[PDB]
Homo-oligomer: 497 residues x 4
Amino acid sequence: VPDATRIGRATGAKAPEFQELYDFDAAALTLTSAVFPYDSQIHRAHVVMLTEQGILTVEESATILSGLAQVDELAATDGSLRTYLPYEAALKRTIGSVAGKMHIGRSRNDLANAGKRMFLRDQLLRTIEAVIGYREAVVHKAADHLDTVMVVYTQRKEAQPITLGHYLMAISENLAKNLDRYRELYARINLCPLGAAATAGTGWPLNRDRTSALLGFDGLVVNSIEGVAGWDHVAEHAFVNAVFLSGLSRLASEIQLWSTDEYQVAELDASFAGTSSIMPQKKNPDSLERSRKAAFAAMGPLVGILTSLNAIEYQYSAARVELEPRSIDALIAATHAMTGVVRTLHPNKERMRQYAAENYSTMTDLTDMLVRRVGIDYREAHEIVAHVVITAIEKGIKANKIGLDLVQEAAVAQTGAGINVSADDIKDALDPWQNVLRREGKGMPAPMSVKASIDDAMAELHKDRAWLANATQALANAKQTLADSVQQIIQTDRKYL
Amino acid sequence: VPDATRIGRATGAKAPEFQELYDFDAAALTLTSAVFPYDSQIHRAHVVMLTEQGILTVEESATILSGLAQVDELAATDGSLRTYLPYEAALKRTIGSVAGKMHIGRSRNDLANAGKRMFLRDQLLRTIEAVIGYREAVVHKAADHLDTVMVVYTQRKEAQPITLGHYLMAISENLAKNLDRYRELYARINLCPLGAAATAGTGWPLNRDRTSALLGFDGLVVNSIEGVAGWDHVAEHAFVNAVFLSGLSRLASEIQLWSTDEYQVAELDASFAGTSSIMPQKKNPDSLERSRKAAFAAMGPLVGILTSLNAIEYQYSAARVELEPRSIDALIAATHAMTGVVRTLHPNKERMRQYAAENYSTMTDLTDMLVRRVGIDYREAHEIVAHVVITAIEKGIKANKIGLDLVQEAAVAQTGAGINVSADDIKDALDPWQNVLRREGKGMPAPMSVKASIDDAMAELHKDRAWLANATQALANAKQTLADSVQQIIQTDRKYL
Amino acid sequence: VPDATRIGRATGAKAPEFQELYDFDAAALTLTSAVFPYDSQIHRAHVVMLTEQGILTVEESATILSGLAQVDELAATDGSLRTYLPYEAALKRTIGSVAGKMHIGRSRNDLANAGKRMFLRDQLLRTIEAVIGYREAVVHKAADHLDTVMVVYTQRKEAQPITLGHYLMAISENLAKNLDRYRELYARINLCPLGAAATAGTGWPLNRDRTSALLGFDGLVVNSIEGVAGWDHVAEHAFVNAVFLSGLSRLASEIQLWSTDEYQVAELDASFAGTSSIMPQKKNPDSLERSRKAAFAAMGPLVGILTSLNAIEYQYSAARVELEPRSIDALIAATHAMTGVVRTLHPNKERMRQYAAENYSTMTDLTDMLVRRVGIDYREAHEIVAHVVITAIEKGIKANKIGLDLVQEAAVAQTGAGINVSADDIKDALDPWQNVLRREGKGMPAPMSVKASIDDAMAELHKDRAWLANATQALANAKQTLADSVQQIIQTDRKYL
Amino acid sequence: VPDATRIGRATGAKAPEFQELYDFDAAALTLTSAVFPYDSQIHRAHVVMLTEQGILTVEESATILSGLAQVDELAATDGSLRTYLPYEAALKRTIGSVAGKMHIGRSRNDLANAGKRMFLRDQLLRTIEAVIGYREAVVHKAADHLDTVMVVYTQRKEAQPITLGHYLMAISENLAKNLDRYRELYARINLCPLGAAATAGTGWPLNRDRTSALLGFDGLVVNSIEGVAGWDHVAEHAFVNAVFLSGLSRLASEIQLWSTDEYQVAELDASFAGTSSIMPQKKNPDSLERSRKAAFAAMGPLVGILTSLNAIEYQYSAARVELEPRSIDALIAATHAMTGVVRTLHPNKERMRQYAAENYSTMTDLTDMLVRRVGIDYREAHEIVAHVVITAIEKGIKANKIGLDLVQEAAVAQTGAGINVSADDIKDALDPWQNVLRREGKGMPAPMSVKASIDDAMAELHKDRAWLANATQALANAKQTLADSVQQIIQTDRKYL
């Protein structure tokens, strides 16, 4: 059965990144189902530590640890066993009374806090990976468009000449700082609240550093109230999602205006556009609009979370709003989709050059030139060139046909004085590619300037990937160390007692 | 004329920190008036740099720089001269045509972006100072209450025994991470977008590193689009305010429940409470409620800013919502007020000890004890002690009068079996101060454990102050260097030409 | 298998209304799956109208209408057939080319707009029903507590004596105005945008009034742009949910403070409370806190929707945020839960009377009495009674033991003058039940005053139910008329051609 | 001194409506200063009623009422006398002890609640007036553009031909429903909570209907808790502002795209555009962007208010966020500005007709035609016409040059079959003005259809104005009745005692 939406101008298949936008909603787990595997890790690491502290005998420990494996498999099909007390009770039906001892010196409060942190931890690494993939597409694309002269806009009005590479490296710098936000957040998420128990700790001599290490954390949430009452990292995760997607919305909006029937300076790749069920001519920006809709929706969780924190005391509370899997799934899908839009975007280079040359974005260089040559102040030069534009529009003269006669009229009509400049000066000022070549300082659109910041982004991307790799490898190490300690106890009990 | 609100039980004056809450609203500047002094700094630093680059002659430079001083003084009483173009025009009326040359290679876009950053920069240091003052009061107060036994709550129900020092050190840990957020933000605020001009730079050979250094920045916003289109730091500043104040709201809510007529475990200092104009008995928590109202209002700017970013392209845009002075003024007033509430809070130690001993917060230790002594699993022990509570309530027995007979009944009625524990074990378990002494791991309420994290917070506060001092001193250095360079040009022109 | 959470003090089963809070999240449909049955109604009504307009022959119509039945059944298990174009294509595989003609003069834009309206329509009636059930429990409960003297609070400080019936009738008045909001909204939701097609109508001679009537609408969205671009009713639905649940959060917070270990003026019914997995004494207000969490989350959709509307033009747009089934499901569950909390709430009448008599909420009547008897101004009387309270607290005198000596001291110590009142006046003023009986104006807690507004709420509830019944019956009528017209065409084609 | 921003292409003065956007921020009152005149009305009406109830002697009443006049004048320059207790104390310094008796049976709680309602009441009428002025400009403008053929957009892609009048009447229908929202809100704002006193009424025999009538209310907030705890009308006022401005943002965004350098289908009037301080060619849409920024900011108050309601009990609370004067002032300025933008907008009719004829918005009529003539299903016809567009773009054929050869190619290349239609059918289908004339059902762009809904909007606007007039006149009547009753008492005391 074919894809019934790939009709008319929607040729080929949806790009896989484009399809994500339609799939994540119905495939998203509940928070309960997504956190549940991490709770089971906590059960194992907590029991291991209880064993190493002499609170559980090695017999008791091995019986429990083997029960968790059995119950974990039951809960794969029985959703009711995914909250703690149903889980504990089913473990008691599987190995008996000893099951209850896995909760010594522990609570649902610090269990839930740790499990949700572990879930948000992986989803944070999942996000950093996607945001790195987003930046790479952006930077790779910039490197191919150092010569693609085009206008930049301000207030949705043509401003000055630049290049597509210049524009894309603004997104790279936006994404670099969003990656810092995410890494900063990670340091506060990857703290372990286990050992806080209900909110006040326990008399049982737990080793909180041990449970924290086995579960992949880089440190502890020290104070026990903060361990269960702390939620600011949930609000911050929601925020960074919101702020990052707002920049993604702006790019998607920028590209959507580029690809209007009236601009026609860019065209979406067919694999990222849909059609209309009624209007055959439509090549619709469904990818851009559905991506932005995910950006708008990220406002919701952030507001919900902060409202819930403003409404309570500094306590554990069941009234606090969560950051849900479906919210992150939406962020990932949009990020993947815009990664694809950017990689496959088709710039219409000739109409780009045309707008830059004809629609008066070069007037600033005409103004600056009068100031460089005849030495008038900028406000006066600006007033003359304004008259030039006003007159040229009235007379239908495109910017690149503006000449000496017209510049002389405006100076006269505005100051009574002529102005001492040559036809060649005007010609230089009105050449959009020279507008680019002259803007060669740090962060400006000249090729050697944009290439320089691309090289910097290359070096920064290598560090981004390195940070991601070390963080991913660290969690894998602790996960492997935990699985070893678990088999160690199960085999020790099997052989020596 | 006396303060007509200090009547009835509202004895003495309002605490000055309490009065701030009523004064900041009517005293708050507009964004235009608050940013305007920083724009004038930018005019000076930008002109200095234009001079050092040979774009302005030293004569032109000195004439401009002297004009800014004159116009700055005019604008102290003429509000209309506080936006750029009115300012430029009044400088032209004061020194003539040369005034226009101060805008060479510059725009209102990067001017405004830099000026607002400078304003938010100082207000960020102002906030860190207040948040440090908030943490100091919290930690100083904790150090005096290592022995103040009291219950901690979860879900607004008495949970386990702790101390006031333990509770306050949860706030200290919350504030430490909010200080990290603010310092992380500072690094992104203290970047200079000047040199971006409209959005694309300029042909004029500016030294952007020079203007950035003279104005106190630690680096550049490199890409020129990001220089004018970047706003994520405004949204992040709004967020950290929102999240930090949400924790402040929770403490104020915690203290407000403490000081209810029904709890009576704490009392606000008279200088932080008001009365009722109708009900003479009221000692009202106006300080707490008005502080929380500031926390709720901080939701607004954050949402407004992110909405505006979701609604535009990646451009300079006049449609973006600002972070207003009055919003920060509200944060500061609430922070100062809660600094005062915490310092002067009166804990009712005896009723604190009473609740801890009588209202069953010690039952967990009774449960843990059965598990330590007779070795039953925790779920079974928990079921027995639950029956103990149910029966003791039915019979009006306070927790600390629970004895061997009752524990034996419940075990029998629940398991058919007696339970092998002594009267002295039960007595230990039910002593609320021993509940505290036994919770002696990291982050737990035992005095030696709370004293340990106080010492850590002492060391962290010293670093907080050091970071603040270095950051404040750096801006003062650059401000002094700028003022010197300005006088240098004015005196060079006066003597040699 | 028993409910593993019903342990300790959590005796019996969860109340069914309480269980809803834990079930709705995993059971909630996607917007696609919830709107899909209504789209199929639209297909039928649209085709019927096309037939009555002579755009489809009766043969074509019957073939289509029979295909929809077949495809509807396929889509019950094939989720992919629940968006339009997959559905149309599968109808074409089932009856052939004629399938395409069901889309004549129609678009996905006005189809989706109408289908979502129909979904929100039923969910709005579902909400009004639940909110009526909420008000009935509130009013029924008030009628049983005209004598339950208790203090009302302001700023979480005891204010004046009232009764539980008085308090509950404030909620009834809050709910009456929320029912008006919902009915006002309904009139704007129940308008039909079908006939707008893409956004501009069509040349095909549709009868829009006909399609609107067959689908249960009370009128048209007239202008065709408004038909597809209109979304304000989605934002308003989100808002009323948010504002109504905020009042529900406040009641749940009110009851949660009532049921603290320190207040003890009310107790949740065991079927609406949980326990702790660690602390056996806990009787936790899970119902209240989880209900409030739904109130906080309703902030999200509202903000998401309005953000999306602020970010677009006045057009159809795929970027607009929806009101999702899971959001409404949360509202319903919380409303049902608080309906149960209110019905089964256990007021502790004796401790209610005790607080009212001892904790100084009667001082206003003491103040008013001095003004009635000796004729001093209220500010002076208020200052005397304030001194009375201050002294009585210092000396440990409960309010109801305040006598003539004390009142005379305070007047002397404050004015130098005695005060001409009798021991019996003071005794009257300090009797909390007389405080109630004297507050007998409109809306005040005296029994005859509260009974009067209960009778009014009875009459209003009868009208609420009548409006609901007429609105439900109207949709059922149109649904039946539609099903008849569909069978009419299928049988006409079967017999005569 | 001239307006230094009216330079370059910013010719003439700012339109006064445009200037409002820059003035309201610095001119906005605090909530305290804006509510204060209404509090003084309440003092008068409350005292009058106390007199009519025999609680005050006519001597006492006249002394008070004359004092309020004196103190009102003092508070015009002394801001400290604008909150209640400072005001009462200064009235006591002016007429003596009797001043205190004006507060009998009253509180700051119901005083503040009523005063803020009165303030929001007038500001609501102020808003309805502005929104009516907005709709009139929209409808007046539509009536002049029944022939202005232009494309409508969906997803920012050209959709189908319409007219400017058709588009504007979508805004009129949006505004009609926003006027209903505002009138619905008004009925809940114009209820009087006075008589509730602290929260529970009073023993003093007040006539609440009397005070309510003298102050212009149409009814009472009956229950006394609801009288002081009720805030839902504040949240609803914030919402309707937010939702209405979101529609205003969308129009401003629509017009801003119209007026891009690339669309050029509309141009802002010079009096509603600014220029750039650097780029002389800029004709910037400052009016549109600053209007949208007001729409985004209206998100803030709404969120702040609902957060504060979610964070408290159902009580009077000083923690509730207000709707501030500056928020409404922003709404009014934007509404006035867009009223001016719409009235003075310059449509470029020829380029409008050009886009409609050349850029393929007529393809739906080409598709519908194949279905009408040869009877193929819509999906097949749609696939053929899609191929037509794809081929015509490839070959550079504008829509209106599409002919029989091309249509025949596509049918063949897509179905193998030719298609039985004439050159004249195709020509009809591709004529954009006939696309309009054929869309002649309810709400469609045909002139006789748009003229019909203009006549309806005319009739609705007359009713809008009538409702506004009756509501304004009613408040003026009660204000005059109050002023009479006040002079009555002052003159009665002067003559007879």
